[PDB]
Write a protein that binds this ligand. Sequence first.
Ligand SMILES: Nc1ccn([C@@H]2O[C@H](COP(=O)(O)OP(=O)(O)OP(=O)(O)O)[C@@H](O)[C@H]2O)c(=O)n1
Ligand SMILES: Nc1ccn([C@@H]2O[C@H](COP(=O)(O)OP(=O)(O)OP(=O)(O)O)[C@@H](O)[C@H]2O)c(=O)n1
Ligand SMILES: O=C(O)C[C@H](NC(=O)CP(=O)(O)O)C(=O)O
Ligand SMILES: O=C(O)C[C@H](NC(=O)CP(=O)(O)O)C(=O)O
Ligand SMILES: O=C(O)C[C@H](NC(=O)CP(=O)(O)O)C(=O)O
Ligand SMILES: [Zn+2]
Ligand SMILES: [Zn+2]
Lengths: 310, 310, 310, 143, 145
Amino acid sequence: ANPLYQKHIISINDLSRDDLNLVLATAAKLKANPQPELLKHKVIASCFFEASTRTRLSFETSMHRLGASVVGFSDSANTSLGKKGETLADTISVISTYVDAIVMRHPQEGAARLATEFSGNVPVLNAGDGSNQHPTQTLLDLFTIQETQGRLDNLHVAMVGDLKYGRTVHSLTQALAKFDGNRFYFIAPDALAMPQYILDMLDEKGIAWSLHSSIEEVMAEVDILYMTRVQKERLDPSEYANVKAQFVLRASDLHNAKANMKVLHPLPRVDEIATDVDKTPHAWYFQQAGNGIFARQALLALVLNRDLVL
Amino acid sequence: ANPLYQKHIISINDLSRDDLNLVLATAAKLKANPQPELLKHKVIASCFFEASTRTRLSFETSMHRLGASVVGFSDSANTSLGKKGETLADTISVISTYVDAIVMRHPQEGAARLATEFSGNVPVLNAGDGSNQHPTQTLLDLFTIQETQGRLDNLHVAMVGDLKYGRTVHSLTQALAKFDGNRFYFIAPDALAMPQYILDMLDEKGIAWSLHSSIEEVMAEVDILYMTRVQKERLDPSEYANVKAQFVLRASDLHNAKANMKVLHPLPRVDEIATDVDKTPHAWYFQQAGNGIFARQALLALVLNRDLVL
Amino acid sequence: ANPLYQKHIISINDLSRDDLNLVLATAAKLKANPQPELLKHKVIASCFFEASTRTRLSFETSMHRLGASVVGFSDSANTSLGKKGETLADTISVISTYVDAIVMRHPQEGAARLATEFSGNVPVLNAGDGSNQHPTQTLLDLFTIQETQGRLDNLHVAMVGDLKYGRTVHSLTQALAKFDGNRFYFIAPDALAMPQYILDMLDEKGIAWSLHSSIEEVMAEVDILYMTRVQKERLDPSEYANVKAQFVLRASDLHNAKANMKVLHPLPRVDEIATDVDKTPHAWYFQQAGNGIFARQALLALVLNRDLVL
Amino acid sequence: AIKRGTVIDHIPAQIGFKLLSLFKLTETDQRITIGLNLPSGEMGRKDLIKIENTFLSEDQVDQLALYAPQATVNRIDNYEVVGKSRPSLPERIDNVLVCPNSNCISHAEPVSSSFAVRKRANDIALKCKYCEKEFSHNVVLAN
Amino acid sequence: VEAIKRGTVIDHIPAQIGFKLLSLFKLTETDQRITIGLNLPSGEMGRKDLIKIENTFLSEDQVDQLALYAPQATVNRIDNYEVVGKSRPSLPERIDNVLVCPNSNCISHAEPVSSSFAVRKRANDIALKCKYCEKEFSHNVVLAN
Ligand SMILES: Nc1ccn([C@@H]2O[C@H](COP(=O)(O)OP(=O)(O)OP(=O)(O)O)[C@@H](O)[C@H]2O)c(=O)n1
Ligand SMILES: Nc1ccn([C@@H]2O[C@H](COP(=O)(O)OP(=O)(O)OP(=O)(O)O)[C@@H](O)[C@H]2O)c(=O)n1
Ligand SMILES: O=C(O)C[C@H](NC(=O)CP(=O)(O)O)C(=O)O
Ligand SMILES: O=C(O)C[C@H](NC(=O)CP(=O)(O)O)C(=O)O
Ligand SMILES: O=C(O)C[C@H](NC(=O)CP(=O)(O)O)C(=O)O
Ligand SMILES: [Zn+2]
Ligand SMILES: [Zn+2]
């Protein structure tokens, strides 16, 4: 079996560089040569306990592109967890008797991990758990950085906005740290800084990083400017000073950007990226979102099909 | 045609022992030898006007396993019944021009029966109508009792909790009463007792039943302990003394249980079954839920495909 | 000084037979010969944290009939306790620097007693504290019984309805038990029975009481039929079966009543007393209400004046 | 044996450890010796607590009569028991207890709890100063 | 404090830690005879705590759980009055059950699972990473049940 066959995909911290590269190689192959019947006869649960547009719809689209069927819900309000008091554990215990894999997003950190403890032999794929991890975002992110930069090592990567609550940057930083020679710039309000457990991991690996108070400081050297939304639904009321985006990127801020530089954003954006950026050649967040199909097709294929695709 | 072809499945009271046995025989066959294209080219409505996890998701999974497509809704709020004032009758009148069968759950008793009066030649399958009937629960329940006990007659069956509002036990009691020599123990608060129309039916058939105030009273003789949730969403405020489960089953209460005894629960449970029961060999409610696939596959096959499966 | 001068009036339990007789005697005198300037230059706080019609308005009317001024609030929502998080302790600490007495009703038991701990030399009069005590209701009740019956001993007294949460009957029973040879009939739902501490008190004094499931059981014996409202704002949701009046007095139930029997009710009534009772000679709940004026004037006069001469 | 201090003897099994917590007895530098589940002539099993150079406060002695009625408090100086008695039951207990009436004002407000304790074989009764409700000490011990 | 025939003696416990060990690991929830000395003279530590639990034995794992509170304690295993085994706690890989994750939005608080943390040395303190939410904390702010 391929190394990812029947594996839970919960946290980037659980995966190796080899795993990440395997997903990307598989993504490239399926994009070049679709296999519309690869997951024929699979039925996969798509269980979203908090809001989503991109992650849920690209995941479901990917299931259909591979010929799998889909059941689930886009909110918990009309599940028996929503109305009859059922625990998440019992919810997973029954759903895992129906389906071949479970894709889940949940507002509490650790929900996907918990699900793995009740899902028996049914793989759980974390579409996001509170402010913790977002591994499939990282997979499509890596695919996009690779496509646009030609490599995943020796890159200058700035991450901007809400780093404390961004499950996206937690996962992406851990992932890029598994490659060699990448350098990080963290541009965040002090209250929403990158968590210490991430910084420690960088230190331990001898990876260079620094804090910056402006985007312009680093614009001239960045290969990837990864913008983020303030996760207002996760903030303590004590942190409401930071609801408004502190860093707004406009087309004019891109004067000294390298030619190769791409602006990424896991989306949705509020105002942290002005619409005038959209037409510039550095804007790549919609392209990034479209890459979710290839990354998520690849992951489902690898988890649910024992042989490597060709 | 098989006896169930194009039939409405509304109430166990409308079915015979032969019908029930036919569903179970068909369930066994499909479990042993899946037929992934049996309902190819069917489109089936899945219409849930109140909450569900198991019934809706297992029903939809069963449709996909047989190759049918699925349309519908998991709540009524964004139907034209929910926002524009449409009657249930007109809702069924239009949906029945689209699809090959309608699966419906509804908060008012009699909704499925009413739907049959507007659905023309489109079969209606009752996924639950208020506190009335739940025939597909009974089918999977029977399948589970059969699997674990080796038979459906001459069994000692205890039913515990909210018997007044449990559509599950209304249907299951009527069903088991169609087999020979079963004996019932009803363990319920007085305010939530098994309805008289069920008791009368037992009397008329000469079936033994008795009331009990504790689980321990009968533990030593039961083959099936069928636990239920208090249906708090159906209670009159006058009945709010009974919201909390009156009978809590724990692992230690199982000391004198027969070796063959299984604990069933249509689910979701609140606290009427303690989590410590889960690891005991008598716990079978998750296995029971998984049997919903086989029962519901069988029913769709029988209703929508004219020949018996092989 | 009179025995009640500058005393807190919190619980009937703290008052003696002589204390109660003194208020009644003073009340009789003020009714016969008004003292419009008795409390001139007094300012009295009327502080109601819970709804009221009779108790607040009769209290304030009483203050005006004696020539005192009134300040306070009928709702806590626009006080600093209501909007700024202020404790009750602090509220009393400041108000007691303004006024000569504090009349207070409050939704928790003990609130009045607590007030006495922060009110310094300013007397607190309990207009009702949760389901505990209602001393001034008992004062006007006693006054009314005395007026209609000519005595406060050797009576046959029935108390009907919500006795558990009826602060009215808690105070009244304790007061009547300080007199000789009274006999009690308690007619209440099991869930709303007279609390055990009241019963124990009656036992210690060798006072006869009994439970009855019907008014008719005792109609021929009673001198005072005291009806109560189900205290729905006090019920635990488990007790909601008792929201409706279990015992409903109608004009026709009085056919065998002693001629001089009076029907009392501290009010408001819902349905426990039908309007056809109002015209019978036995109805005395509005005259009872009226007597609140003379009882409350008496209490205010005795608390705020060393001696009265009349 | 100890030279000076207190030996709390004849404590019921499974109560000794609770006492250590509640009276914060181990929050000291004084030498302490504890026996749990010791054999006892009159009790079968007992707990035993020795604290050197230390005597129970008046509060703790009062609280002891509730938690461990038939326990024995020994006062000791120069290796001798100069005082031996079961703890005197008080008629009032403040601060430590919690009124089980959830609608009691004493939960929301900055006052000390207070109960009139009434020895009442079998269960000792506790009447709340505020709500005036009375409870078995079995129920009040659910703080 | 007096010798035992059979069981475990946890010796050389730092002062103010003995009671914490009894509370945290629920050592007194048993019918076996326990003997405890608190604030005993050591001449090696100055002051020490000492816990004796009869007819009761601790695995290497259970002994390791002690490492977070008494890393230089000695656990003596006793049979027929003889010390048949001495061991020192070594830092465990994980701490399960007894602690509570300080992240209020962690799934572990709402669901029927047992708490669990990965243990590591950071800057001469102990960092605890929750199995579920993956947030990491100084062991000081991770409260017990
Ligand atoms: N210098 C001392 C003297 C006595 N004790 C303890 O104090 C308790 C009671 O002392 P004592 O009256 O001498 O023993 P008993 O006669 O058994 O008292 P009782 O009848 O109450 O059991 C015993 O546990 C004993 O160990 C002590 O620790 N130090
Ligand atoms: N039957 C026994 C044997 C030993 N002990 C206790 O076990 C501990 C260690 O035993 P031992 O090796 O004999 O003493 P030490 O040589 O001092 O050990 P260490 O150097 O580790 O302190 C001491 O607290 C001793 O009181 C005991 O309670 N009962
Ligand atoms: O919400 C964000 O800002 C980033 C990230 N966004 C997404 O995954 C896109 P969506 O919520 O539409 O699926 C997330 O963590 O949910
Ligand atoms: O709700 C119950 O307790 C029993 C029964 N439960 C089910 O059918 C399972 P679900 O509501 O998840 O589909 C029902 O009547 O709806
Ligand atoms: O409310 C009752 O039924 C009895 C009693 N009623 C009154 O005191 C009359 P009011 O609430 O109108 O001042 C009370 O305890 O508040
Ligand atoms: Zn109280
Ligand atoms: Zn956590």
